[PDB]
Design an enzyme around this catalytic site. Structure first.
Site, PDB file in Angstrom:
ATOM      1  N   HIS A 284       0.805  -1.219   0.000  1.00 14.68           N
ATOM      2  CA  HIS A 284       0.000   0.000   0.000  1.00 14.68           C
ATOM      3  C   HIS A 284       0.848   1.284   0.000  1.00 14.68           C
ATOM      4  O   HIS A 284       0.277   2.358  -0.148  1.00 14.68           O
ATOM      5  CB  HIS A 284      -1.092   0.037   1.087  1.00 14.68           C
ATOM      6  CG  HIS A 284      -0.627   0.078   2.519  1.00 14.68           C
ATOM      7  ND1 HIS A 284      -0.061   1.217   3.066  1.00 14.68           N
ATOM      8  CD2 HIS A 284      -0.782  -0.843   3.500  1.00 14.68           C
ATOM      9  CE1 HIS A 284       0.161   0.934   4.339  1.00 14.68           C
ATOM     10  NE2 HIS A 284      -0.255  -0.297   4.648  1.00 14.68           N
TER      11      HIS A 284
ATOM     12  N   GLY B 174       2.599   6.109  10.576  1.00 11.06           N
ATOM     13  CA  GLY B 174       3.996   5.903  10.231  1.00 11.06           C
ATOM     14  C   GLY B 174       4.534   4.544  10.664  1.00 11.06           C
ATOM     15  O   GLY B 174       5.646   4.179  10.292  1.00 11.06           O
TER      16      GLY B 174
ATOM     17  N   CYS C 100       3.463   1.477   9.765  1.00 12.78           N
ATOM     18  CA  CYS C 100       3.332   0.472   8.704  1.00 12.78           C
ATOM     19  C   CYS C 100       4.697  -0.024   8.269  1.00 12.78           C
ATOM     20  O   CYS C 100       5.612   0.779   8.062  1.00 12.78           O
ATOM     21  CB  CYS C 100       2.542   1.020   7.520  1.00 12.78           C
ATOM     22  SG  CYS C 100       0.852   1.540   7.923  1.00 12.78           S
TER      23      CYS C 100
END
Ligand SMILES: CNc1cncc(NC(=O)[C@@H]2CCOc3ccc(Cl)cc32)c1C
Ligand SMILES: [Cl-]
Lengths: 299, 300
Positions: free
Chosen positions: A41, A137, A139
């Site tokens: 993503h 942040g 991820c």
């Protein structure tokens, strides 16, 4: 003495954390050999093949400390993006990618901008979510276990569900749970308690000198499971009973004798008392975690 | 979202752990630059521990009596000196993995990460607090002596604790990295006991503000309290007195949530009176006191 929620030492994983930027999005990546792994993503109803085909190598900025790595290739494997880089990570530890089962625990190295900020221990819930601690942040942060000198990577963070719990994939990009990497209505299923882990934690309490909950009684596996099902506890199988064998031999309390204590605790509560400083029955320590912490295995 | 008991990444400390052996005793040491720091009781026998004369035991030792192992490499000891309850072993090699560091002495209520080690090998990391009675509720087995406590703020590792002993109640006592013990403890096997422990009030309040930040307000009430009335109630539940310093320290969390510190104190008074009534706060059925105001701001 003492019993803490203990994580594996994170150093071998710290040396693999990088920052991945694509357009306006920044998240974390895992740099192993000459490949950087991150959630797909980072390139974002998405059509990932269509979004990826429009990207070139120079669209992905990879930062390892104060050094920029050059991306020389890119490919997708399920929900993970793999960025081929020119430089192999000299701090690459001995590693494996492993897919874990619900009930199994692991350490999470929470990162922001490719910089590790904390380490905590957690378990894969029966509903395939994790009760983590993540902000924007986070991820690309990873979950792992360390066995001897080998780091087994088992989780990569992808999203937070509306109830504040988290969803992610293994390092081959397959989600744990019926989740998808898309902005759509998704919810964690009804969760259950990990029975084998509560029993392991009860054995840890006995080892540390807490015996108030023990009783003279025993139960059958079938009667215990009828009780456990009423209290939203995961069924206890014969494999669980076998795995608890060592702890049962060390403390002198048969697994079905410990199940009789658990049955009484579920039906009556703790009555103002605590077990290992907790007023709730803890389910995020496996039988192996209990043995490891009450033996002293080093890495 | 979420709130976990979180430890600092331990890698910077892992690269400093060594094994120190003197005679029959083996424990952990911290290798920073060309010095290895370890508990001075590494020179004692179990007999020596009742009334050891460390100056007399140390004067009889030479450099080659101390075996220091860093991984599979033996370091050469070229000097030794005692500073309070820490032995400092000068070695011939500076640790190339020495991070940016400081030695800091902490106050009760402060939290830190512990890297538990055995035979110079790290086995786990956990988060804990310096209790008001100067002990820590750790998880240590035989061979863990020399394990260290630390915080990492920015790229600097601040070492604040070195493990020395376990008290009869299963709690732990240790020193700062200059060898001064926290509390009235001594590195002697004489009758020693932890004093009555209290709850760290400023930390419970910080954790209540963390719960409000994460969307939990069930425990709030329409009441306020004076600081003196709160302390008279707090003392009856074995809570540490709340000082004006603590009220000032909670200022930012009060401003962020819109709940005055004395308004939050009134919720705490009501929680102590009524309990949780089957409810939880941040997944806990007890009032948590091992998160400081600084930890809450860091993680939320
Ligand atoms: C779980 N066992 C354990 C955990 N942590 C440290 C220790 N070591 C000690 O307590 C030693 C042995 C017993 O007598 C004393 C008295 C004073 C001092 Cl400073 C150290 C000791 C153990 C044995
Ligand atoms: Cl402090």
């Amino acid at each position: 003495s003492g019993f803490r929620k203990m994580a594996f030492p994170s150093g071998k994983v710290e040396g693999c954390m990088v920052q991945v930027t694509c357009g306006t999005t920044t998240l974390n990546g895992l740099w192993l050999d000459d490949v950087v792994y991150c959630p797909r993503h980072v390139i974002c109803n998405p059509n990932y093949e269509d979004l990826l085909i429009r990207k070139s190598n120079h669209n992905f900025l990879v930062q390892a400390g104060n050094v920029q790595l050059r991306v020389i290739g890119h490919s997708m494997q399920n929900c993970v993006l793999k960025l081929k880089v020119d430089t192999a990570n000299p701090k690459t530890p001995k590693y494996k990618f492993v897919r874990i089962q619900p009930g199994q625990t692991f350490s999470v190295l929470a990162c922001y901008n490719g910089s590790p900020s904390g380490v905590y221990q957690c378990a894969m819930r029966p509903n395939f979510t994790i009760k983590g601690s993540f902000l924007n942040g986070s991820c690309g942060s990873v979950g792992f276990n360390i066995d001897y000198d080998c780091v087994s990577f088992c989780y990569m963070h992808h999203m937070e569900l509306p109830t504040g719990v988290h969803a992610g994939t293994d390092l081959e990009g397959n989600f744990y749970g019926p989740f998808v990497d898309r902005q759509t209505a998704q919810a964690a299923g009804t969760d259950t308690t990990i029975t084998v882990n509560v029993l392991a934690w009860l054995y840890a309490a006995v080892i540390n000198g807490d015996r108030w909950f023990l009783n003279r009684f025993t139960t059958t596996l079938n009667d215990f499971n009828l009780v456990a099902m009423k209290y939203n506890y995961e069924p206890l199988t014969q494999d669980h009973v076998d795995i608890l064998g060592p702890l049962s031999a060390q403390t002198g309390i048969a697994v079905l004798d410990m199940c009789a204590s658990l049955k009484e605790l579920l039906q009556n509560g703790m009555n103002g008392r605590t077990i290992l400083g907790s007023a709730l029955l803890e389910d995020e320590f496996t039988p192996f975690d209990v043995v490891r912490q009450c033996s002293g295995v080093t890495f």
